[PDB]
Amino acid sequence: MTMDATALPSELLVTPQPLVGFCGLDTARVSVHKAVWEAFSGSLQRKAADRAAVQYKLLPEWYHPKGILKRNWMLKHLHVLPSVVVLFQDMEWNDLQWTEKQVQCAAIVQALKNTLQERNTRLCLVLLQRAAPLPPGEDLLAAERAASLTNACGITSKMLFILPHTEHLTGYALRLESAFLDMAQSYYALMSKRIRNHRDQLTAAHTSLKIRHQFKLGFVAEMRQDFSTGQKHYFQAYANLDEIRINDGNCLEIKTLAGFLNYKICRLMFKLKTPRDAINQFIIHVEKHKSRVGFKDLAFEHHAWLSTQHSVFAELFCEAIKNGLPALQTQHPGIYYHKAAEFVMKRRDAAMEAYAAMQASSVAEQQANMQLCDQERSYNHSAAIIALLSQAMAQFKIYKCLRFRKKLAIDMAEEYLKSGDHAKALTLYSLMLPDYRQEKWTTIFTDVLLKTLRCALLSGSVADYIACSVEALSLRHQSDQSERILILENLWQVFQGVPPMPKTQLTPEAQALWTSALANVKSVEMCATFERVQLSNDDLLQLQLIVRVLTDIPLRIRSFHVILADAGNPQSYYQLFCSTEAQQFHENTQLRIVRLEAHMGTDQVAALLTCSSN
């Protein structure tokens, strides 16, 4: 009829490769088969240029398509069914035990040809003539034993191959691979012809079976490296899907199929390096899809799948990087990494909506749809969101794009906020806030500042909390004055260590958590000036440091401190007595204080605001 091409992801993520089989071989031989398999794993030892694509696997109206009709047929074709069958055996040249070799290899090839009769596959046999090498044209018993084979089965002579000694076995394995390339491409072409002949007939114009056929056609082509032909048959299948009706119960499956198709064709793009072509196909179909659905769209569908769309395309971005293309990433390291990240954000928001529509009183299996939601309720951790953010983070960091990755970092911390996970949010914010002050732009600086307020109060890193709060009061004039007053009260509280006021948010658990704090914690702008330095060991300096408050609200005028320095030798507007210098120290030392540390109101500004000298 019109059955799905496949509902199976995680398929052929690596470059698809042929498979030729090896039978169930016992441990008794596996040791020497080790060497045997070594040559086989030699395909994985050698460079891709030397490496043959094929690998190994083990086993013990109109008429309906055979080999195409179902997606498990596709997959079983992919790896379960080898294009060619090869059974490796040993052949010691002897007299009558070698006749027993004849009978035994006859039995095994009889079983093998029965299996082939099940599944229409070409066969080859490999024999180690473990004896010493001899010239070709010497062993008539080779012909005799081939004839014993043929009367048993009829396998052609040339399909027989020999790997006498390991030092010989290696080269004979290389040419084995070459011959296998031969037969494998032969079988692949034969199946290609099968598909095209199938496609020339319609079972009463079902029109979707042929879609499966052209899909499998692309499979064949990419097996045979004709990437262009197969990718364009894929795209033609996309066109065919377009011709199909939309918005039915199928349209979601249509969208997923087109996702498969976009995946494959974009692979074949970047293999052929047609970048903007891949971009155009990507967009074209994805906005097709956004149009095609207006609802249901429970938005773990067509939104999460949108996320997976950008996920696969990011996969193909990194695939290009492994290939080495710098184009789109000089443009945008991952155009779609963070994009899929915001798509999983909308995923989670839609999940919140799902909970909302659930909070309604919540017969065509809508409960299963609700059960869908329950399934969708599972993928609500949104930690995978955080990880996708991490990949986008690193991906943009690849070309050292600090700003963008930093703002994705504040994204991460915001998400941890949404999840209620204050800790690591606070960590990333702790990194960002000095950065944001370095960007000098106070607006978002303050916005992440109140975010940090929430983060630290929830965490209880009240040292960090108050540091951000105080550099916030520095220039908090963009915010409410009364909240400045409240926060200043919080400042005196924390300096005393007594619980801070924003109990309007606080709940007792984290409250106690930070009550634990500050037992360990150990430690608006004004100006420093000098009337005289570099003295003649007679001068007397004095308070040239103008203590200015740029906060509208005052801080309680408590007290003062000055800290002595040792270079060379050891020795609105509010001003009050300090007599900072009356100690007649030694000459030519400019004691410029690291930080002010006078006791106005409380200890200090601590967060790194102190000037040098005159």
Coordinates of C-alpha atoms in Angstrom, one line a residue, residues 84-505:
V84 CA 27.9 -12.0 -1.0
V85 CA 28.5 -15.0 1.3
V86 CA 32.1 -16.1 2.1
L87 CA 32.9 -19.1 4.3
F88 CA 36.6 -19.5 5.2
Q89 CA 37.9 -23.1 5.5
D90 CA 41.2 -24.8 5.8
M91 CA 42.6 -27.1 3.1
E92 CA 45.6 -29.3 4.0
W93 CA 46.8 -31.2 1.0
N94 CA 46.7 -34.9 2.0
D95 CA 45.5 -38.3 0.9
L96 CA 42.4 -39.6 2.7
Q97 CA 42.0 -37.4 5.7
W98 CA 41.9 -34.9 2.9
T99 CA 39.0 -37.0 1.5
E100 CA 37.4 -36.4 4.9
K101 CA 38.1 -32.7 4.3
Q102 CA 36.3 -33.2 1.0
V103 CA 33.2 -34.6 2.7
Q104 CA 33.2 -32.1 5.6
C105 CA 33.6 -29.0 3.3
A106 CA 30.9 -30.6 1.2
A107 CA 28.6 -30.8 4.2
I108 CA 29.3 -27.2 5.2
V109 CA 28.8 -25.8 1.6
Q110 CA 25.7 -27.9 1.3
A111 CA 24.2 -26.2 4.3
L112 CA 25.5 -22.9 3.0
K113 CA 23.9 -23.3 -0.4
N114 CA 20.6 -24.3 1.3
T115 CA 20.9 -21.0 3.2
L116 CA 21.6 -19.2 -0.1
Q117 CA 18.6 -20.8 -1.6
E118 CA 16.7 -19.1 1.2
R119 CA 18.2 -15.7 0.3
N120 CA 19.5 -15.7 -3.3
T121 CA 23.1 -14.6 -2.5
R122 CA 26.4 -15.2 -4.2
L123 CA 29.0 -17.4 -2.5
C124 CA 32.8 -17.9 -2.2
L125 CA 35.1 -20.3 -0.3
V126 CA 38.6 -19.5 1.1
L127 CA 41.0 -22.3 1.9
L128 CA 44.4 -22.2 3.6
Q129 CA 46.8 -24.6 1.9
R130 CA 48.8 -24.5 5.1
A131 CA 51.6 -26.5 3.5
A132 CA 54.7 -25.0 2.0
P133 CA 54.1 -22.9 -1.2
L134 CA 54.3 -24.5 -4.6
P135 CA 54.1 -23.1 -8.2
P136 CA 50.6 -22.6 -9.6
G137 CA 49.8 -25.4 -12.1
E138 CA 51.2 -27.9 -9.6
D139 CA 48.2 -29.1 -7.6
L140 CA 45.9 -31.3 -9.6
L141 CA 44.3 -32.3 -6.3
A142 CA 43.2 -28.6 -6.2
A143 CA 41.2 -29.3 -9.4
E144 CA 40.0 -32.6 -8.0
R145 CA 38.8 -31.0 -4.8
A146 CA 37.2 -28.2 -6.7
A147 CA 35.4 -30.9 -8.8
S148 CA 34.3 -32.5 -5.6
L149 CA 32.9 -29.1 -4.6
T150 CA 31.1 -28.7 -8.0
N151 CA 29.5 -32.1 -8.0
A152 CA 28.4 -31.3 -4.5
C153 CA 27.3 -27.8 -5.3
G154 CA 28.6 -26.3 -8.6
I155 CA 30.4 -23.2 -7.3
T156 CA 32.7 -21.8 -10.0
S157 CA 36.4 -22.4 -9.7
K158 CA 37.4 -18.7 -9.6
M159 CA 35.3 -18.1 -6.5
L160 CA 37.7 -20.5 -4.7
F161 CA 40.6 -18.6 -3.0
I162 CA 43.7 -19.6 -1.1
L163 CA 45.6 -18.0 1.8
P164 CA 48.4 -20.5 2.7
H165 CA 50.7 -18.7 5.1
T166 CA 50.2 -15.6 7.3
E167 CA 52.9 -13.6 5.4
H168 CA 51.1 -14.8 2.3
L169 CA 47.6 -14.6 3.9
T170 CA 47.9 -10.9 4.2
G171 CA 48.3 -10.2 0.4
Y172 CA 45.8 -12.9 -0.5
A173 CA 43.4 -11.1 1.9
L174 CA 44.0 -7.8 0.0
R175 CA 43.1 -9.5 -3.3
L176 CA 40.3 -11.2 -1.5
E177 CA 38.9 -7.7 -0.7
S178 CA 39.3 -6.7 -4.3
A179 CA 37.5 -9.7 -5.7
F180 CA 34.8 -9.1 -3.0
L181 CA 34.5 -5.6 -4.3
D182 CA 33.9 -7.2 -7.7
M183 CA 31.1 -9.6 -6.6
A184 CA 29.6 -7.2 -4.1
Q185 CA 29.1 -4.5 -6.8
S186 CA 27.8 -7.2 -9.1
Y187 CA 25.1 -8.1 -6.6
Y188 CA 24.4 -4.4 -5.8
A189 CA 23.9 -3.7 -9.5
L190 CA 21.7 -6.7 -9.8
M191 CA 19.5 -5.5 -7.0
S192 CA 19.5 -2.0 -8.6
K193 CA 18.1 -3.5 -11.7
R194 CA 15.6 -5.3 -9.7
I195 CA 14.5 -2.1 -8.0
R196 CA 14.2 -0.2 -11.3
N197 CA 12.2 -3.0 -12.9
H198 CA 9.9 -3.0 -9.9
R199 CA 9.6 0.8 -10.2
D200 CA 8.5 0.6 -13.8
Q201 CA 5.4 -1.3 -12.6
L202 CA 2.7 0.0 -10.3
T203 CA 0.3 -2.1 -8.2
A204 CA -2.6 0.0 -9.4
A205 CA -0.6 3.2 -9.0
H206 CA 0.0 3.0 -5.3
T207 CA 2.6 5.7 -5.9
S208 CA 4.2 5.2 -2.5
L209 CA 5.7 1.8 -2.9
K210 CA 7.7 3.4 -5.7
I211 CA 8.7 6.0 -3.1
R212 CA 10.2 3.2 -1.0
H213 CA 11.8 1.8 -4.2
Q214 CA 13.6 5.1 -5.0
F215 CA 14.7 5.3 -1.3
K216 CA 16.2 1.9 -1.5
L217 CA 17.6 2.9 -4.9
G218 CA 19.5 5.6 -3.1
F219 CA 20.7 3.0 -0.6
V220 CA 22.0 0.9 -3.5
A221 CA 23.7 3.9 -5.1
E222 CA 25.5 5.0 -1.9
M223 CA 26.6 1.4 -1.5
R224 CA 28.0 1.7 -5.0
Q225 CA 29.3 5.3 -4.5
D226 CA 27.1 6.9 -7.1
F227 CA 26.2 9.5 -4.5
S228 CA 24.7 12.0 -7.0
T229 CA 22.2 9.6 -8.6
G230 CA 21.1 8.2 -5.3
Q231 CA 20.8 11.6 -3.6
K232 CA 18.7 12.9 -6.5
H233 CA 16.5 9.8 -6.3
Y234 CA 16.1 10.6 -2.6
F235 CA 15.1 14.2 -3.5
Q236 CA 12.7 12.9 -6.2
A237 CA 11.2 10.8 -3.4
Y238 CA 10.9 14.0 -1.5
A239 CA 9.0 15.5 -4.4
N240 CA 6.8 12.4 -4.5
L241 CA 6.0 12.9 -0.8
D242 CA 5.1 16.4 -1.7
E243 CA 2.6 15.1 -4.3
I244 CA 1.0 13.0 -1.5
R245 CA -1.8 14.5 0.5
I246 CA -0.9 16.4 3.7
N247 CA -2.4 17.0 7.2
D248 CA -3.7 13.5 7.5
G249 CA -2.7 11.2 10.4
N250 CA 0.2 10.5 8.0
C251 CA 1.5 14.0 7.7
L252 CA 3.7 13.6 10.8
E253 CA 5.1 10.4 9.3
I254 CA 5.5 12.2 6.1
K255 CA 7.6 14.8 8.0
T256 CA 9.7 12.2 9.6
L257 CA 10.3 10.5 6.3
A258 CA 11.4 13.8 4.9
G259 CA 13.7 14.0 7.9
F260 CA 15.3 10.7 6.9
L261 CA 15.6 12.0 3.4
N262 CA 17.1 15.4 4.4
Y263 CA 19.5 13.5 6.6
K264 CA 20.7 11.3 3.8
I265 CA 20.7 13.8 1.0
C266 CA 22.6 16.3 3.2
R267 CA 25.1 13.6 3.9
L268 CA 25.5 13.2 0.2
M269 CA 25.8 16.9 -0.2
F270 CA 28.6 17.4 2.3
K271 CA 30.3 14.3 0.8
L272 CA 30.2 16.1 -2.5
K273 CA 30.6 19.5 -0.7
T274 CA 27.5 21.3 -1.8
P275 CA 27.0 23.3 1.4
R276 CA 24.4 26.0 0.5
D277 CA 22.6 23.3 -1.5
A278 CA 22.2 21.4 1.8
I279 CA 21.1 24.6 3.5
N280 CA 18.5 25.2 0.9
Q281 CA 17.1 21.6 1.1
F282 CA 17.1 22.0 4.9
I283 CA 15.2 25.2 5.0
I284 CA 12.9 24.4 2.1
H285 CA 11.6 21.3 3.7
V286 CA 11.5 22.5 7.3
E287 CA 9.3 25.5 6.4
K288 CA 7.2 23.1 4.3
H289 CA 6.8 21.1 7.5
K290 CA 6.0 24.1 9.7
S291 CA 3.3 25.1 7.3
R292 CA 1.9 21.6 7.0
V293 CA 0.9 21.3 10.7
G294 CA -1.2 23.8 12.6
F295 CA -2.0 21.6 15.6
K296 CA -1.1 18.1 17.0
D297 CA 1.7 19.3 17.1
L298 CA 1.4 18.4 20.7
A299 CA 4.8 20.0 20.1
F300 CA 6.8 17.1 21.3
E301 CA 6.2 16.4 17.6
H302 CA 7.3 18.7 14.8
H303 CA 9.1 20.7 17.6
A304 CA 11.2 18.0 19.1
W305 CA 11.6 16.6 15.6
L306 CA 12.6 20.0 14.5
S307 CA 15.2 19.9 17.2
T308 CA 16.4 16.5 16.0
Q309 CA 16.4 18.0 12.5
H310 CA 18.9 20.6 13.6
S311 CA 20.6 17.9 15.6
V312 CA 21.3 15.8 12.6
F313 CA 22.4 18.9 10.6
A314 CA 24.8 19.8 13.4
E315 CA 26.1 16.3 13.2
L316 CA 26.7 17.0 9.5
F317 CA 28.4 20.3 10.4
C318 CA 30.9 18.4 12.5
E319 CA 31.1 15.8 9.7
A320 CA 32.1 18.6 7.4
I321 CA 34.7 19.7 10.0
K322 CA 36.2 16.2 10.0
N323 CA 36.1 16.5 6.3
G324 CA 37.6 20.0 6.8
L325 CA 35.3 22.5 5.3
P326 CA 35.7 25.9 7.0
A327 CA 33.0 27.8 5.0
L328 CA 29.8 27.8 7.0
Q329 CA 31.7 27.9 10.2
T330 CA 33.8 30.9 9.4
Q331 CA 30.2 31.9 8.7
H332 CA 28.8 30.1 11.7
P333 CA 30.6 27.3 13.6
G334 CA 27.3 25.6 14.3
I335 CA 24.6 27.4 12.5
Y336 CA 22.1 25.1 14.1
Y337 CA 23.6 23.9 17.4
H338 CA 22.2 26.6 19.6
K339 CA 19.3 26.8 17.2
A340 CA 18.3 23.2 18.1
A341 CA 19.0 24.3 21.7
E342 CA 16.3 27.0 21.5
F343 CA 14.1 24.4 19.8
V344 CA 14.4 22.1 22.7
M345 CA 13.6 25.2 24.9
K346 CA 10.3 25.5 23.0
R347 CA 10.0 21.8 23.4
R348 CA 10.0 22.2 27.2
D349 CA 7.7 25.2 27.1
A350 CA 5.3 23.1 25.0
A351 CA 5.7 20.4 27.7
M352 CA 4.6 23.0 30.2
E353 CA 1.7 23.7 27.9
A354 CA 1.1 19.9 27.8
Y355 CA 0.8 19.9 31.6
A356 CA -1.6 22.9 31.2
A357 CA -3.9 21.1 28.8
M358 CA -3.6 18.1 31.1
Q359 CA -4.8 20.3 34.0
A360 CA -8.1 20.4 32.0
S361 CA -10.5 17.6 32.6
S362 CA -7.7 15.6 30.9
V363 CA -12.7 8.6 22.0
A364 CA -10.2 8.2 19.2
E365 CA -7.3 7.1 21.4
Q366 CA -6.7 10.6 22.7
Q367 CA -5.8 9.0 26.1
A368 CA -3.1 7.2 24.2
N369 CA -2.4 10.7 22.8
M370 CA -2.5 11.7 26.5
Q371 CA -0.3 8.6 27.0
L372 CA 1.8 10.2 24.3
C373 CA 2.0 13.2 26.6
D374 CA 3.0 10.9 29.4
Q375 CA 5.7 9.5 27.2
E376 CA 6.5 13.1 26.4
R377 CA 6.3 13.8 30.1
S378 CA 9.3 11.6 30.4
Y379 CA 11.6 13.8 28.2
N380 CA 11.2 16.7 30.5
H381 CA 14.5 16.6 32.3
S382 CA 15.8 19.1 29.8
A383 CA 19.3 18.1 30.8
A384 CA 19.7 17.2 27.2
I385 CA 18.9 20.8 26.6
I386 CA 21.8 21.7 28.7
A387 CA 24.1 19.3 26.9
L388 CA 23.0 20.7 23.5
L389 CA 23.9 24.1 24.9
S390 CA 27.2 22.6 25.8
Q391 CA 27.9 21.4 22.3
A392 CA 26.9 24.8 20.9
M393 CA 29.1 26.4 23.5
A394 CA 32.1 24.4 22.5
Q395 CA 31.3 24.6 18.8
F396 CA 31.2 28.4 18.8
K397 CA 34.3 28.4 21.0
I398 CA 36.0 26.4 18.2
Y399 CA 36.7 29.7 16.3
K400 CA 37.1 31.3 19.7
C401 CA 33.8 33.2 19.7
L402 CA 33.8 34.3 23.3
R403 CA 30.8 36.6 23.4
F404 CA 28.3 34.3 21.8
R405 CA 29.4 31.3 23.8
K406 CA 29.2 33.4 27.0
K407 CA 25.6 34.4 26.2
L408 CA 24.8 30.7 25.6
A409 CA 26.4 30.2 29.0
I410 CA 23.9 32.7 30.6
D411 CA 21.3 30.7 28.7
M412 CA 22.5 27.6 30.4
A413 CA 22.3 29.3 33.8
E414 CA 18.9 30.6 33.0
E415 CA 17.8 27.1 32.2
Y416 CA 19.2 25.7 35.5
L417 CA 17.0 28.4 37.0
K418 CA 14.0 27.1 35.1
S419 CA 14.9 23.6 36.3
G420 CA 15.4 25.0 39.8
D421 CA 19.0 23.9 39.8
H422 CA 20.6 27.0 41.3
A423 CA 24.1 25.6 41.8
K424 CA 25.6 25.3 38.3
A425 CA 23.6 28.3 37.2
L426 CA 25.4 30.2 39.9
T427 CA 28.7 28.8 38.7
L428 CA 28.2 30.0 35.1
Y429 CA 26.8 33.3 36.3
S430 CA 29.8 33.7 38.5
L431 CA 32.0 33.3 35.5
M432 CA 29.8 35.7 33.4
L433 CA 29.3 38.6 35.9
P434 CA 32.9 39.8 35.9
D435 CA 32.7 39.4 32.1
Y436 CA 29.5 41.4 31.9
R437 CA 31.0 44.2 34.0
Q438 CA 33.9 44.1 31.6
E439 CA 31.4 44.7 28.8
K440 CA 30.6 47.8 30.7
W441 CA 27.0 47.6 29.7
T442 CA 25.1 47.7 32.9
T443 CA 21.6 46.8 31.6
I444 CA 21.9 43.1 30.9
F445 CA 24.7 43.2 33.5
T446 CA 22.0 44.1 36.0
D447 CA 19.5 41.6 34.6
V448 CA 21.9 38.7 35.1
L449 CA 22.6 40.5 38.4
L450 CA 19.1 39.9 39.7
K451 CA 19.3 36.5 38.3
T452 CA 22.5 36.0 40.4
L453 CA 20.6 37.3 43.4
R454 CA 18.1 34.5 43.0
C455 CA 20.8 32.0 42.3
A456 CA 22.9 32.9 45.3
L457 CA 20.0 33.1 47.7
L458 CA 18.8 29.7 46.6
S459 CA 22.4 28.4 46.8
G460 CA 23.5 30.4 49.8
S461 CA 26.8 31.5 48.4
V462 CA 26.0 34.6 50.3
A463 CA 29.5 35.9 49.9
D464 CA 29.0 35.9 46.1
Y465 CA 25.4 37.1 46.6
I466 CA 26.5 40.2 48.5
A467 CA 29.4 40.8 46.1
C468 CA 27.0 41.0 43.2
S469 CA 24.5 43.0 45.3
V470 CA 27.1 45.6 46.3
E471 CA 28.6 46.1 42.8
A472 CA 25.0 46.4 41.8
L473 CA 24.3 49.2 44.3
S474 CA 27.4 50.8 42.8
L475 CA 25.4 52.0 39.9
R476 CA 21.9 50.6 40.6
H477 CA 20.2 53.9 39.5
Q478 CA 18.5 51.9 36.7
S479 CA 16.5 50.1 39.3
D480 CA 14.0 51.0 42.1
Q481 CA 15.4 53.0 45.0
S482 CA 13.3 51.2 47.6
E483 CA 14.8 47.9 46.5
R484 CA 18.2 49.4 46.8
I485 CA 17.2 50.3 50.4
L486 CA 16.1 46.7 51.1
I487 CA 19.3 45.3 49.6
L488 CA 21.3 47.7 51.7
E489 CA 19.5 46.3 54.7
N490 CA 20.4 42.8 53.4
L491 CA 24.0 44.0 53.3
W492 CA 24.1 45.0 57.0
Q493 CA 22.3 41.7 57.7
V494 CA 24.9 39.5 56.0
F495 CA 27.8 41.6 57.5
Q496 CA 26.2 40.8 60.8
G497 CA 25.5 37.4 59.3
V498 CA 21.8 37.5 60.4
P499 CA 19.4 36.2 57.8
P500 CA 18.7 38.5 54.9
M501 CA 15.3 40.1 54.3
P502 CA 14.3 38.6 50.8
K503 CA 12.4 36.0 52.7
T504 CA 9.6 36.9 50.3
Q505 CA 11.3 34.3 48.1

